[PDB]
């Protein structure tokens, strides 16, 4: 006979607050410009995809770019989709973490729409890292990023004790 037993297991007490994805609102004003720009990149020539706009869409190149090889470009922006199925959780639990230790001004934007499976199915993987050094796009990227899309860290900034979190899991035991 099978009996269900609840076992107490210690949770990471701050992983919910470490994965508090930033507050994004009035976001359909942004996907129009972003998707139109990405399509206009991806139409003509694979060299002309990355020749006027330098962007990296492979996670190994994201790690090698944020390691410290290129230090000139200080404003560098990232776009990562959450709340979207068919997206790996192994990278997604480490993407907002690796950008924190980067000395460059890296600006993560979490895309909140679940229906946005287009950018993953089209370009590479569903993430986008590019540079706003002298491009035209920064002329609106600096406009809205101060409004709603602010990214700051409250969790490591001040000194604060954290309460413990002990959860409990299901276990089916046959006897």
């Amino acid at each position: 006979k099978r009996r269900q037993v609840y076992k107490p297991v210690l949770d990471n007490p701050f992983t919910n607050e470490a994965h508090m994805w930033p507050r994004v609102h009035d976001q359909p004003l942004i996907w129009q410009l972003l998707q139109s720009s990405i399509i206009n990149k991806l139409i003509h020539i694979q060299s002309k995809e990355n020749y006027p706009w330098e962007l990296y869409t492979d996670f190994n190149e994201i790690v090698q770019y944020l390691s410290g090889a290129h230090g000139n470009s200080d404003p560098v922006c990232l776009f990562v989709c959450n709340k979207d199925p068919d997206v790996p959780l192994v990278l997604l639990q480490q993407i907002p973490l690796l950008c924190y230790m980067a000395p460059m001004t890296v600006k993560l934007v979490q895309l909140p729409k679940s229906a946005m499976d287009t950018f993953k199915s089209v370009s590479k993987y569903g993430m986008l890292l590019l540079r706003c050094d002298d491009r035209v796009d920064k002329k609106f990227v600096s406009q809205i990023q101060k409004n709603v899309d602010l990214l700051q860290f409250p969790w490591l900034n001040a000194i604060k004790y954290r309460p413990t979190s002990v959860k409990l899991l299901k276990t089916t035991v046959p006897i």
Partner: protein
């Protein structure tokens, strides 16, 4: 299939043990971060010690942890991987995360998406 019994009387000894484990994890993580933000690796063999002692206490009272903790900490030297060496992907395998000591913790990511751990599934978990 069987009998459905949900007890919320948590036991005092298990709460003491998991508070001890969580305090060791918090003090090791905060030592590591307070050292890492300011300057170079000063007392990186110190905080690791706590984690090792933590894992040994996890060997004593038969306790299990979430895969977030064991994914954070190492396996052999048992150190925190908040600052790892290198992260590589699609290098003819799935994924690789290198460390300073040389012990790697890889994950099968090139097979298929939408795979979750047993503690991360929709209904298997009840908080507090």
């Amino acid at each position: 299939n069987g009998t459905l019994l949900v007890p919320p009387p948590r036991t005092i000894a298990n709460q003491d043990h998991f508070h001890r484990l969580n305090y060791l994890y918090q003090i090791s993580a905060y030592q590591t971060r307070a050292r890492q933000k300011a300057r170079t690796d000063a007392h990186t063999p110190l905080a690791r010690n706590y984690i090792k002692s933590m894992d040994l206490i996890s060997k004593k009272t038969k306790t299990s942890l979430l895969p977030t903790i064991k994914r954070t900490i190492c396996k052999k030297c048992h150190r925190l991987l908040w600052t790892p060496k290198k992260l590589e992907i699609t290098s003819d395998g799935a994924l690789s995360v290198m460390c300073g000591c040389g012990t790697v913790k890889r994950f099968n990511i090139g097979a298929d998406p939408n795979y979750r751990t047993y503690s991360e599934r929709e209904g298997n978990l009840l908080n507090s």
